[model samples]
Target: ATPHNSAQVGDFAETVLMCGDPLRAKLIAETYLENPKLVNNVRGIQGYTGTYKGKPISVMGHGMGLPSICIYAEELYSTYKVKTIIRVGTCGAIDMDIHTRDIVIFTSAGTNSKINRIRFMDHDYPATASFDVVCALVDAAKELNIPAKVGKGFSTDLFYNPQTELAQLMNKFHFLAVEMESAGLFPIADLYGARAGCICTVSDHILHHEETTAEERQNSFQNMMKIALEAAIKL
Candidate 1:
C-alpha cells in the first residue's frame, strides 16, 4: 500500500474511472457497477472495484487540483499497475458555445502550474490525453449520439482565479473550459507509460455567470456519467 491508498496490489482493476469528489465515485460505483466492493478508503479518498457489462472496472476519487490528483494518480499507476485512467468531472465553460450540462472531451490540457516548468527546465511539456482513449470517447459519443465537443482545456492551480484577463486569453485561444486536474493527470500518466484522458460536464459558464444548482452539479450529470461509463467499458 502507498501513503494514500490502502488497497492490496491486486485490488484495483486495470481501468479506473476517477472524479474529483469521493461522493461522485461512490455514486458511479453504486449506480453502474455490479457487486461493487470498496477497496480503499485511505485518507477518505474512496475507491471501489466492480464489473461493468461483465468487465472488471474501478472508480476512485482523486480530490481537487493538480497536486492532489497527481499524488493519487502516481500511486495508482506506479504501485497498483493500473493501465488506464479516465477522469470524469465538471468544469466551468470558457467558450460561449459551451453551455451548462454540455460535455467536453479533452484532447489536451494547458496549465499555468509550475510543476512542468520546473521539471522541464521552464520549457513546455505537452500534456496530452491518450489518443486511443480520445478516439474511443468520440466514437462512443457518435454511436450513442451524445452531443460532445472535443478540444483542449486549461487547468489552473487557482479555483477562485483573480486573473480575468488570463481567462479571456485562454478563451480567445479556443480552450473549451477550465478545470483543476487534467493537466496533472495527463503528464503523470505519460511519465508512467499509462493511458489517461478526461471528460467534463460544464457546470458553470464563466463569461455569462451562469451556473447549475449544487444538487444538479452533484447528482444530475447523468448524461456525462453515462458517456464516461460507456467509454470506460470500451477501454
Candidate 2:
C-alpha cells in the first residue's frame, strides 16, 4: 500500500474508472458493480473494486483539479500496476454548439496548467487519449445509442474565475468543453505506457448561462458512466 492509497497489492483491478466526486465513486460502485468492495477510503478519496460483466474493474475519485488527479493517476499507475483509467467527469460547455447534458469524448486535451511544461522541460507534450481507449469509448457510445461530441477539450487550473474572453477564444479554436483533469492525466498515462481517456457530461453551458441543479450535477450522469463501464470491460 502506498501513502495515499490504502489498498494492498491486488486490491485494485487493472482498469479504474475515475471521477472528481468521491460520492460519485460510491454511487457508481453501488449501482453497477457486482459485490463491490471498498478497497480504499483514505482521506475520503473513495476507491472500490468489483466486477462488470464478469470482468473485474475499479472506480475511484481523483478530487477536483490537475494537481489532485495527477497524484492519484501516478500512484495508480506506478504502485498498483493499473493499465487503464477512464475519467467520467462533468464539464462546462465552452462552445454554444455543446449543450448541457451532452456527453463529450475528449480525443485530445489542451491545458493552461504548467504541470506538463515542468515535466517536459518547458515544452508542450501532446496530451492525447490512447488510440484504443478512444476507439472503445466511441464504439461504446454508439452501441448504447448515445450521441456524443467527439472532440478536443481544454483543461484549466482555475475554475471559479473563468475568463469569458479567453473562453471565447478557446471556442473559436474548437474546444468543445472545459474540464479540470484530463490534461494532467493523459501525459501521466503516456509516461507509464498505460492508457487513459476522459468522457465528460456537460453540466453547464458557459455561453448560454445554462446550468444543472447542484444535486443533479453531483448525483447523476449515468450515460457517461455507462460508456466508461462499457469501455472498461473492453480494455
Candidate 3:
C-alpha cells in the first residue's frame, strides 16, 4: 500500500473501473470479474484487480468530488502506470430530453472547480475525454443496442448549495447533465497522457425533481456499467 491505495505495482490491471461508491466497485468485481481479489481497502475504499472475460482488469472506488478522485488517479497513473480509467457513476440530468436511468457519456465538461485553474497557471483548461475511449464506449453502446447520450456536462463542487442560477446558465449553454468529478479528471489525465473518460447514469432530473429510489441507485446503473466494461476491454 502506498498512501491512498494499498495495491503494489502490477497489482492493478491496465484499465481500472472507478465508481463513486466503493460498494458498487465491489459488486462489479465480484459479479463480472473472474477470480477477483481485493488489493486495497484503505480508508474503506476498496480496490480489486482481476480479469473480465479473460482480459485483465481492475475496479476501484474513486469516491466523490475532484480532490478524492485525483488522489487515486495520480497514484494509479504515475505510480502504477495504469493506462486507462473509466469512471462510472450517477448524474442529475439537466436536459429535458435525458430522463432518469438514461446513460450519458460526457465527451467534454466545464467545471466550477478550481483544481484545473491551479494546474494551468490560473487559466481555464479544457476538460475533455480521450477520443479513442469515447469511440470505444460509443461503439459498445451501439453494438449492444443500449441507448445513450453523448454530451457536455457541468461538473461542480457544490452539492448542497443552491446553484439554481448556475445550473440554468449551464443548461442554456446546452450542458447535458451535472455531476461532481469529471471536470477535474480530464485535465489530470491530460497531464500524464493516460486515457480517461466518464460514463454516468442519470439518477435524477434536476428541473423536474424526478429521481430514482435508493435501491435503483445501487442496481440501476447496469447499462452504463456494461458499456464501460465492454469499452474497457476493447481499449
Screening candidate 3 with a backbone cut-off below 3 angstroms (N, C-alpha, C), the clashing residue pairs are: 1-6
Q: Residues 106-138, candidate 1, lDDT per residue (tens digit)? A: 999999898877777899988899998898888
lDDT of 3: 0.86
Off by over 4 Å in 3: 211-220
lDDT of candidate 2 at residue 149, scale 0 to 100: 91
Error of 1 at 228 (Å): 1.4
The digit string of per-residue lDDT tens for model 3 on 1-235 reads 5788777899999898898999988988998899998989998888999898899999999888889888888899898999998988888888777788889999988888889899989997889988888999999999889888998987878876476787677667778888888888787888888889889998888778676677765555877888998999899
The global C-alpha lDDT for each of the candidates, from Candidate 1 onward, is 0.88, 0.90, 0.86
Model 2 alpha-carbon drift over 4 Å, by segment: 211-220
Candidate 2: residue pairs that collide: none
Ranking by lDDT: 2, 1, 3
lDDT minimum window of 10 residues, candidate 2 = 211-220
